[PDB]
Amino acid sequence: MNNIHTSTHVSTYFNEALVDRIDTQKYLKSNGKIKKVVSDPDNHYTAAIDDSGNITVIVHKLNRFVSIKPSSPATHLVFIRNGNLLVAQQNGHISQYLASNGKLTSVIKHHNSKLLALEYNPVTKQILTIANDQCTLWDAQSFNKIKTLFAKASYFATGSLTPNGQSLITSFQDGNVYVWNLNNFEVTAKSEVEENMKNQKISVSADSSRFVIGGSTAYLYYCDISHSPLCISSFALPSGSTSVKKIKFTHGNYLGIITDNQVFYAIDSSTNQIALEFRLPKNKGITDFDINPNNLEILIVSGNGEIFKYDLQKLFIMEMNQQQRLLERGIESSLVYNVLKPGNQNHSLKFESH
Template identity: 20%
Template sequence: MYNKYVTLINVFIVINSKEPKHKDYQRNLKIKNVYCLLSINNSKLIKNNSGIKKDIVNDISFCSICVDYGILKCITKDLSFDDNNHENNSILDGVSKDIEESNIAKLQHFKMGAIDQKGNIYIFDFERNTYNLIARSGISANCISFNPYNKNEIIVGHTNKSIRSYNIGSKKLAVVLSSYHHSEPYAFSFHPHQPYLLSTSFKDVIVWDLSENSCLRVLIGIQDSEIQNAIFSKSGQQIIASFLNGNILIWNSETFNMEWKISLEALKNENIIIPKKHFPTNLQNTSLLIMSKDNTQLVYGGMGSTLFIWNIIEKVLQYELNLTILNSSALKRIEYVGNKKMVVVLSNDGNLVFINTKTGSLIAFRNEIKCSSFTLSNDGEFIFLILNQKSKVLIYSTSQLINYQKPVNIKSLKESSKETEGIIEVGSNTTTQVRSLYETIDQHKLPENKTEYELYSSKDIHPAVINFKKKYPLKIYRVLRSMEKIMSMLCYWSPVFENIDYLPNMIFPFVKIYENDTFSCFEILLTVIINYCQKWWEFYPNPPIECLDMLESLLSYHDKELYNHFVKYNITSQYYGWELVNNFFSDILSKNEWLCLWDNILTSCDPSYLYYFVIAYLKYLKKSILRITDIEDFMFFIHKENPCQFSKIIRLTNEVKKCTPEDLKFKKILKPYYSLSSNTNYPIFNEYPKYIINYQTKLKEKIRLEEEEYLKKK
């Protein structure tokens, strides 16, 4: 099998721990532990005519490739090459036993088209084990694709602004589409049901009717609004285009009426003109806009190294991912992996990033293989890479290339050292990637109860939250909208939150982290409230007396001098304890410090960790506190950021926890950490005096109705 590829294709195979058969494997690939099924080398093509050597072509570069499913209808005699000019002519002899038969068998169902820098178009038919030179166009190209409506044709977007179709069977030019483009076309998109083609250039987008080879529509970009990309939706009902002014427009593909406008200017709250330096320097196979096959998500990567993911059904931005791992390199190509909620992202530097579009998380990062372009098979099983030197096309099994990385193991962080007890410090890798830790909790501990979440989220904004915009006029609309939604859902979940004035301060840091993912944010807040807010509202509107009493005893044990100072000047635990805890320390900590603290809180799975931190924080600032004798001065002091070495406070917190005797530990009054179950509804939260809450709710509703009635009369 594959013996006809001997002179054109070097086959590199790695099976488990066995050494590769080819002695130059590591030298040629310069990578380790990445499985390569086939390597197509186009640097030493030697053309023959009737057995007589005709010409030698060296250093041919592939410009673009395409892949399609199915066998070609008409295959002519394959090219022959000079066997004397190649070493390892029998490279496949004795290797077939080691080939991963399952992957090779799947690969045989595909065919690949490729065009090189001299305009030579090749077809590789893996089923028949043949390759063919289809045409010598003499013109380089930016994009190439099989015609889905005529499997025996291949369409090429040339650098001379023309689009041509070649017949694979006859090896002849079939048609040249009229040259309406004002710049080089670099991307194609096909209608899923009709014979329509979208071709994108920097100046314009053209809708073609391939059945009549005619132009239907021309979309022209104006000054400062040049076009980045245009695609058909997977349903074929919309045309989606992105522009350099930060707008993404969605039209009906039949009426060409605009259905939706996405403005990145509104998201960023500033005027946006995307610099051309953020556009790929090499236009070949550029694709910055892609839609999932189930027509629910739209992914855009035309702003440097930032990736935007929209929910098309709800018309909301799900994620705005700044891919810092790419070191500010602009994105060049994005493709979905089959039917999965996963995209492959290629940067200008040739690095590949695999992103889970459902959770907005990083799956894998590959910087060992520097490639200039790539494409995927329809089912996502195989990925075809053009290396940066462009003389090779590597074919991989996508799952093996991804090499899924395991998420953070929370227990290993906890048990990594008996002395440090898993302390996570500011600036460490674990705290700078706090989002991945939260996603680990999402995956293993949160219920992901989408059905019940939608019951809460589908409700109108709760009356208790209607005036939130007036009280807190946040500049960023996206954060304001997320705050309103989360607060409203919490009010519907439990009436106690209708009357809590400090609720916005409690939830704001979590909403800021998850401003584009209210689903995860809501479930994380439920987990935090159920575990770390135990007994907080049992004596509402008074503070949690039991918890503060335990805190006083704890301070008296660990620092008698500080405790006596508070007693002397009538500074109660309501001031030095409750004022710190009830907003989750958002007033006194910077962003990185807050993230570091919550890394430690969540990894500890200890509901009393917050109170140990209060003691450690007070002890660390003891010298400053002992000079304060007035309650107002103390309130000012504990509601501002005080300079500190935060890692020392975290260590001190763990020391306080370790040295606390059993009779002073909060487990006497607090329940153990509880993970929300994925098999049941959200838990009921009714740990509050119902008669007070009900009375306040009725009173507020009465006042609200009276105000509405007064305004109507007025």
């Protein structure tokens, strides 16, 4: 007495209308369970990390997998169009394998960090690593470096590149979010903010007209370059959110969200409201996600041990329908979604950028 269970907002959604199955009997061989999902920008080679840490690339048409022998887990995976896998390992190094073989080719090291969050820009050939106090920008072929962004004191929390264009946004613990001339090491855009946030991350759109910030406090910030400041506003989150662990952009005006209340959300940034809400049984739980943008093919790792097995594009049907039936009555989306209202300057991450 008392908390929430079970799986009605997650396994019931995820497995609603599948055409194949991750037959987890073939994957969960550890004495233990799957804990994290890391994934392919080229979408298909998504991968599982279990409590051993061996990366299993699940190939969702074969119901076969690439068993990567080293047990070192990834923070995230990057793949390129030519068949290579760059693994940002939790060991402080980024390790590239032929994706096609799981065969080690090279390691990027310079970082001293627990986290090496990655993002790959397929139109720049550039991969960025967010780690400790620095951003390392490098040629995606991964055998050299371009720049090491850094600071005298504000510690680094995050940043990312823009996949269908190019601009680099980074932020500090200060919440200060700023934009770099990633190829001149110039801060061209600068902010000073009120909301300090530990372990914040910046989600960067492929066409980076839009940006999002998460972190240890229960807030979400949203940028829109068509307006000044780029970060125009901030807002508080649906009741029960305590912090935000992970935020990532998708094709439509949308982001996946993981909070530290372990509820996952899909947010529509055109309004800054939540479209989808995801919940699992008590620990057990939901631990991480992988969204593949064309259909939002999804690899979810749950603490419940289940490896999913769903497309957000298909789950949206339930909040397309439902909502559209209610639209025949005239239900308001700002309530359905819970729009998060722009607040004061007192806790904003407002940022001018050009």
